[PDB]
Amino acid sequence: PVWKDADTTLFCASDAKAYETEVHNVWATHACVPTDPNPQEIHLENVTENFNMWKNNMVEQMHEDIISLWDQSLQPCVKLTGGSVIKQACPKISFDPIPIHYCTPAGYVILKCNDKNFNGTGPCKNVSSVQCTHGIKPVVSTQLLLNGSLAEEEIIIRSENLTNNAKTIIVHLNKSVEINCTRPSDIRKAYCEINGTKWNKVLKQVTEKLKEHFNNKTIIFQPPSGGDLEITMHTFNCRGEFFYCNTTQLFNNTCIGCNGTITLPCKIKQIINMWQGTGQAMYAPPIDGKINCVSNITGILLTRDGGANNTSNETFRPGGGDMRDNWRSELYKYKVVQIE
Ligand SMILES: CCCNC(=O)N1C[C@H](N)C[C@H](C(=O)Nc2ccc(Cl)c(F)c2)C1
Ligand SMILES: *[C@@H]1O[C@H](CO)[C@@H](O)[C@H](O)[C@H]1NC(C)=O
Ligand SMILES: *[C@@H]1O[C@H](CO)[C@@H](O)[C@H](O)[C@H]1NC(C)=O
Ligand SMILES: *[C@@H]1O[C@H](CO)[C@@H](O)[C@H](O)[C@H]1NC(C)=O
Ligand SMILES: *[C@@H]1O[C@H](CO)[C@@H](O)[C@H](O)[C@H]1NC(C)=O
Ligand SMILES: *[C@@H]1O[C@H](CO)[C@@H](O)[C@H](O)[C@H]1NC(C)=O
Ligand SMILES: *[C@@H]1O[C@H](CO)[C@@H](O)[C@H](O)[C@H]1NC(C)=O
Ligand SMILES: *[C@@H]1O[C@H](CO)[C@@H](O)[C@H](O)[C@H]1NC(C)=O
Ligand SMILES: *[C@@H]1O[C@H](CO)[C@@H](O)[C@H](O)[C@H]1NC(C)=O
Numbered sequence: 288p289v290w291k292d293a294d295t296t297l298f299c300a301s302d303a304k305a306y307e308t309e310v311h312n313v314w315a316t317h318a319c320v321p322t323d324p325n326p327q328e329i330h331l332e333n334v335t336e337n338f339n340m341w342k343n344n345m346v347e348q349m350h351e352d353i354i355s356l357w358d359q360s361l362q363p364c365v366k367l368t369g370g371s372v373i374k375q376a377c378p379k380i381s382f383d384p385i386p387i388h389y390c391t392p393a394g395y396v397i398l399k400c401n402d403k404n405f406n407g408t409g410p411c412k413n414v415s416s417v418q419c420t421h422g423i424k425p426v427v428s429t430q431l432l433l434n435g436s437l438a439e440e441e442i443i444i445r446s447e448n449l450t451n452n453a454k455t456i457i458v459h460l461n462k463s464v465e466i467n468c469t470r471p472s473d474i475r476k477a478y479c480e481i482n483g484t485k486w487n488k489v490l491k492q493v494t495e496k497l498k499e500h501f502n503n504k505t506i507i508f509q510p511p512s513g514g515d516l517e518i519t520m521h522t523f524n525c526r527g528e529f530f531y532c533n534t535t536q537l538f539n540n541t542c543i544g545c546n547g548t549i550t551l552p553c554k555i556k557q558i559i560n561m562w563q564g565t566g567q568a569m570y571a572p573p574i575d576g577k578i579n580c581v582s583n584i585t586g587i588l589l590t591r592d593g594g595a596n597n598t599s600n601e602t603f604r605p606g607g608g609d610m611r612d613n614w615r616s617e618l619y620k621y622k623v624v625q626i627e
């Protein structure tokens with residue numbers, strides 16, 4: 288077996304159900320093939336391969352997919368794009384993401400890093416070859432990574448350049464923390480419940496691994512200092528509704544009598560700034576009754592403050608400036624190569 292580094296157009300595979308009206312199933316039924324019924328993972332013995340999650344074309348490929356999934360799936364009452372206004376019908380839709388497998392065509396193969404504490408760049412000594420990645424849910428989110436996979440041993444810090452403060456940091460947790468978001472039966476006010484004990488325990492460990500990477504300086508968390516609501520708030524879609532939740536209680540440092548349930552104030556917003564970059568979208572008011580979603584916090588997006596090089600401290604705020612890193616945090620151990 289011999290291969291070289293290569294980019295190629297991938298196809299997608301799903302367990303999408305053709306009878307479903309849910310938009311991710313609708314999309315993957317007409318835009319993906321069925322899941323590999325006999326997927327074979329092939330260990331490459333005493334091969335060491337280099338990987339680079341920040342320089343990986345599958346990320347931009349998955350990105351183009353999720354954009355076209357959202358363009359076909361969501362129907363706003365009004366789109367505000369490039370100085371024109373298009374207004375269509377905005378019926379409520381069924382929204383619940385499903386895992387998407389990414390697969391190489393003929394003559395290419397996907398390599399998978401399996402070293403447990405791989406950080407995303409550098410050599411991997413435990414390499415396998417696969418035909419499709421594992422099922423990845425396209426969870427659109429800010430501040431927290433939701434419903435993703437877990438690191439298998441220690442918590443991992445991922446960055447293209449930790450000494451560059453403009454590069455987003457991906458925190459891969461080894462322990463999921465549940466975040467239970469409810470809009471009960473003003474109709475836009477909602478709330479997310481988190482186990483404070485669980486979260487403060489994990490974040491303590493996040494601080495200790497960050498301190499391992501910032502030469503034992505004191506690690507401080509802070510809320511985002513300004514921006515649009517999509518930045519200052521943890522946003523996500525629960526059943527077609529766009530939730531905006533204040534996380535200031537999560538990135539508090541004293542709790543690093545607060546060991547019970549954190550209750551995060553949330554609001555369902557009709558008008559949003561589109562993460563596609565294309566502008567302002569307006570949706571209809573939320574459905575009647577209780578809107579609940581229980582998700583797994585599996586990672587944190589952090590950007591570190593600048594100008595503290597002569598300081599005792601490093602101060603980190605939640606979030607990043609590109610949906611692509613959400614995809615990166617599940618595609619980090621994957622690499623396409625051309626078979627030579
Ligand atoms: C001229 C600029 C237009 N710009 C935007 O409209 N922006 C600016 C930035 N590129 C990305 C921002 C974002 O994160 N939106 C979002 C929407 C829904 C969910 Cl569920 C979510 F988690 C996040 C939105
Ligand atoms: C390499 O990874 C495999 C698959 O995840 C796992 O069984 C173990 O960590 C390693 N095994 C060998 C033989 O290196
Ligand atoms: C990733 O691992 C390499 C060693 O292979 C190391 O040089 C690099 O700094 C690591 N990245 C981070 C963000 O720690
Ligand atoms: C998670 O990682 C930390 C170190 O990063 C470690 O102390 C802790 O035991 C790990 N937890 C689990 C459940 O593996
Ligand atoms: C990381 O960022 C710092 C400051 O932004 C820069 O001086 C350094 O050259 C960068 N390292 C790499 C490997 O690009
Ligand atoms: C949440 O994480 C647990 C393990 O931490 C896992 O068993 C469960 O399936 C996850 N839930 C979702 C919706 O991914
Ligand atoms: C989520 O919260 C609601 C109300 O706060 C509660 O009724 C429900 O049982 C909770 N679910 C889980 C899994 O904690
Ligand atoms: C938080 O997790 C602990 C274990 O870490 C568990 O015993 C407790 O029930 C949880 N508390 C809440 C409020 O969910
Ligand atoms: C950082 O702190 C730990 C404390 O456990 C210590 O073992 C380690 O040697 C320190 N490293 C540096 C470079 O100060």
Ligand SMILES: *[C@@H]1O[C@H](CO)[C@@H](O)[C@H](O)[C@H]1NC(C)=O
Pocket residue numbers: 519520533534535
């Ligand atoms: C989050 O809540 C705090 C008070 O708990 C408030 O001061 C802050 O302005 C809120 N964030 C936003 C973006 O409104």
Ligand SMILES: *[C@@H]1O[C@H](CO)[C@@H](O)[C@H](O)[C@H]1NC(C)=O
Pocket residue numbers: 383384426433434523524525526580581582583
């Ligand atoms: C995470 O997965 C659970 C179970 O599939 C789902 O109910 C929940 O809505 C998901 N969260 C998000 C933000 O998609």
